[PDB]
């Protein structure tokens, strides 16, 4: 389970923190009132993570340690709220029996026994926290019929704790408290046990024939050298670094930093900037993405009497934008205008794409012209698009 994977990683860290030679020093300090066994400070945890996990930012190491505490691997001995502080606050490791990876979804009947046992401690003078006392009142109302047996169960546990080693009893009482600090947290604290609803859930002759066709299909795939692939990724990204607002400050300013929306109005203007026109030259996809670039591209081709390829491509792209109710009649209109013999805007396909399209029109669909659009797209990419970028119209836009 995915929730178990982060527990094992946290438990690996706890295993390294408990090493003899290079672990967290566990001390028995004394205060003005009492002696406190087997404790260590929060700054000890933060400095251990910085060194042994190589975390430069102390905020990141403190944040990682605060999630281990919240999940219940170490806990503050003086607070029901499980968090980590980068100071002298004293902490204590959780015993592996109370670990969240140990199949723990405790019931309210177990919490009622615990809360009932707590009110018996200290000669029945222990006072629960306000949220604990309010939890006990709800549990007493819920288990009102069987409360005599919850009391007997807690009274039986208290007799074991009474005849128990004083130092082990002190440590285990806080560890049992830290267990319930995870599964019944303080109101306002994140319940680390809440989980995502998605995650809360023949002969050996045909076998070889199934293999051979499988591997042959894999060999038919066209792959590239990592050098060529890395070169194209490096050059494509470097091309747009000047356009990336996270990397280069926008002109005039980033609206989220300056509260000035003039950058958005310039991006939406019908008069394009020089960087916007320069971007059209990166490739035909950039010219077609930009609505102004699409208008100027089409405006140029119509001025050279060669727009039939682009207007067909634009017609097919609109076809795939129509509801399926409209596509059968629209397929016939595209066929009559661009492909049928004697068409007003006749385009020239290869015989393979024209034959396939003629049969696809017999049964219209959203992908009737895909084989043809694919051909026309590559044709413009090598003919109509270089004509637009090299036109005086584009050059006069590129030079302002």
């Amino acid at each position: 389970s995915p929730n178990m994977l982060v527990y094992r990683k946290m438990e690996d860290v706890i295993a390294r923190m408990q090493d003899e030679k290079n672990g967290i020093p566990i001390r028995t300090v004394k205060s003005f009132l009492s002696k406190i066994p087997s404790v260590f400070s929060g700054s000890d945890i933060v400095q251990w993570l910085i060194k042994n996990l190589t975390i430069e930012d102390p905020v990141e190491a403190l944040h990682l340690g605060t999630l281990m505490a919240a999940h219940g691997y170490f806990f503050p001995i003086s607070d029901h709220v499980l968090t980590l502080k980068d100071d002298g606050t004293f902490y204590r490791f959780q015993t592996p029996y109370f670990w969240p990876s140990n199949c723990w979804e405790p019931e309210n009947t177990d919490y009622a026994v615990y809360l009932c046992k707590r009110t018996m401690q200290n000669k029945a003078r222990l006072e629960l926290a306000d949220y604990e006392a309010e939890s006990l009142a709800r549990l007493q109302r819920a288990f009102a019929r069987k409360w005599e047996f919850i009391f007997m169960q807690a009274e039986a546990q208290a007799k074991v704790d009474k005849k128990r080693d004083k130092i082990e009893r002190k440590i285990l009482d806080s560890q049992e408290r830290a267990f319930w600090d995870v599964h019944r947290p303080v109101p306002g604290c994140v319940n680390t046990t809440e989980v995502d609803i998605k995650k809360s859930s023949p002969p050996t002759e045909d076998e070889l024939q199934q293999q051979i066709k499988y591997w042959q299909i894999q060999l038919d795939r066209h792959r590239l050298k990592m050098s060529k692939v890395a070169d194209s990724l490096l050059s494509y990204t470097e091309q747009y670094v000047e356009y990336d607002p996270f990397l280069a400050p926008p002109d005039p300013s980033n609206p989220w930093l300056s509260d000035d929306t003039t950058f958005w109005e310039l991006e939406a203007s019908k008069e394009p900037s020089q960087q916007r026109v320069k971007r059209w030259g990166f490739g035909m996809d950039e010219a077609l993405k930009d609505p102004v670039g699409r208008e100027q591209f089409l405006k140029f081709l119509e001025s050279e009497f060669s727009s039939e390829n682009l207007r067909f491509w634009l017609a097919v792209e609109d076809l795939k934008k129509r509801p399926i109710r409209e596509v059968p009649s629209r397929v016939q209109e595209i066929w009559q205008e661009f492909l049928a013999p004697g068409a007003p805007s006749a385009i020239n396909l290869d015989s393979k794409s024209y034959d396939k399209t003629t049969q696809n029109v017999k049964e219209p669909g959203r992908y009737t012209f895909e084989d043809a659009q694919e051909h026309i797209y590559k044709l413009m990419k090598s003919d109509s698009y270089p004509r637009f970028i090299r036109s005086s119209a584009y050059q006069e836009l590129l030079q302002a």
């Binding site: 944040h63 999630l67 998605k198 002759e205 990336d244 996270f246 990397l247 895909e370």
Partner: protein, 352 residues
């Protein structure tokens, strides 16, 4: 001898033919693996210091925020939560403009229509529904609800295509599906994932009829929306694939997983080309998205933090604190000026 059918004499001929094709592919894959991306990226200069901060805090949802999507106008945002409410914000001013309550809890998916006049959403209702957006006074969004998609398990992700007329859906029943919004008709079903499908992302090339998806089977799959077949699959994560996103050129895509790693796959190289991880990052990555140039990969993790990655060099350039619970969704602004994170702490934050 003089008898014996000798079936194994021909089975060994087929075994020696299947072994050779497999070794043929292994040797070809090794031959193409001449360098590593981060080794070539040593030619690139390292990035400067980043000072990204929270610029807006969207407070209003009553429970865990589970998804969000930017509007094409670069400022409006749709967001959904566990309590069933979907909210449309003007994030630049943080004003709530629209809101609809759904008949289910855990509305795990929401999307913004390309026109900006509709939204789609769904979750434990095992459906995906389209709601219109209007400037109507006392607008009743629920009365215009258009039920489009329909699965046998929960809806995990959804997305309009290049128009308001079709939506992609990913479901916990192991299928992705393309739908006609106006009629509710199933245009294509995508079977292949061995477990729940958790995410999907449409190909950046509006010329491309492909999309990628990730699931609990640790796989990411590229689909052909015309045939319905999976044309390419990747399995290198050690746990669930929670989010997928295409690199801006469309020749690559990234993924975030519960194994606390983010990985970059290149479709031309047909292999994983980068792994984004660190010893101190042990919680799963729930969402990933690229900056405009693809140099930066933003990722939201269950450790409540956001880690920004240099896509080319692999090093982590920033870690961002602020959310007080898991980061469930993260998307970069349509113009790349900001990115928005949604969290289980009931809030969304816009960073820049």
């Amino acid at each position: 001898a003089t008898d014996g059918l000798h079936e194994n004499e021909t089975l060994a001929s087929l075994k020696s033919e299947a072994e050779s094709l497999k070794g043929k592919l292994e040797e070809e894959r090794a031959k193409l693996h001449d360098v590593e991306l981060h080794q070539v990226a040593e030619r690139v200069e390292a990035l400067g210091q980043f000072v990204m901060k929270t610029r807006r805090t969207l407070k209003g949802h009553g429970n865990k925020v589970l998804c969000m999507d930017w509007c094409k106008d670069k400022r409006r945002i749709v967001s959904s939560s566990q309590d069933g409410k979907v909210i449309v914000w003007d994030s630049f001013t943080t004003n709530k403009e629209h809101a609809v309550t759904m008949p289910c809890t855990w509305v795990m998916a929401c999307a913004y229509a390309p026109s900006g006049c509709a939204i789609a959403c769904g979750g434990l209702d095992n459906k995906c529904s389209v709601y219109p957006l209007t400037f109507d006074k006392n607008e009743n969004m629920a009365a215009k609800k258009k039920s489009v998609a329909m699965h046998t398990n929960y809806l995990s992700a959804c997305s309009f295509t290049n128009s308001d007329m079709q939506i992609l859906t990913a479901s916990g029943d192991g299928t992705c599906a393309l739908w006609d919004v106006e009629s509710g008709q199933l245009l294509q079903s995508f079977h292949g994932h061995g477990a729940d499908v958790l995410c999907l992302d449409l190909a950046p090339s509006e010329t491309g009829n492909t999309f990628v998806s990730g699931g609990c089977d640790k796989k990411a799959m590229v689909w052909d929306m015309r045939s319905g077949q999976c044309v390419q699959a990747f399995e290198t994560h050690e746990s669930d694939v929670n989010s997928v996103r295409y690199y801006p050129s469309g020749d690559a895509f990234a993924s975030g997983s519960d194994d606390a790693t983010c990985r970059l796959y290149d479709l031309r190289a047909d292999r994983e080309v980068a792994i984004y991880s660190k010893e101190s990052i042990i919680f799963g990555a729930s969402s990933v998205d690229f900056s405009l140039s693809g140099r930066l990969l933003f990722a939201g993790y269950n450790d409540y933090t956001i880690n920004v990655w240099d896509v080319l060099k692999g090093s982590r350039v920033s870690i961002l604190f602020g959310h007080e619970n898991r980061v469930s969704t993260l998307r970069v602004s349509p113009d790349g000026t900001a990115f928005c994170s949604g969290s289980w702490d009931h809030t969304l934050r816009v960073w820049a």
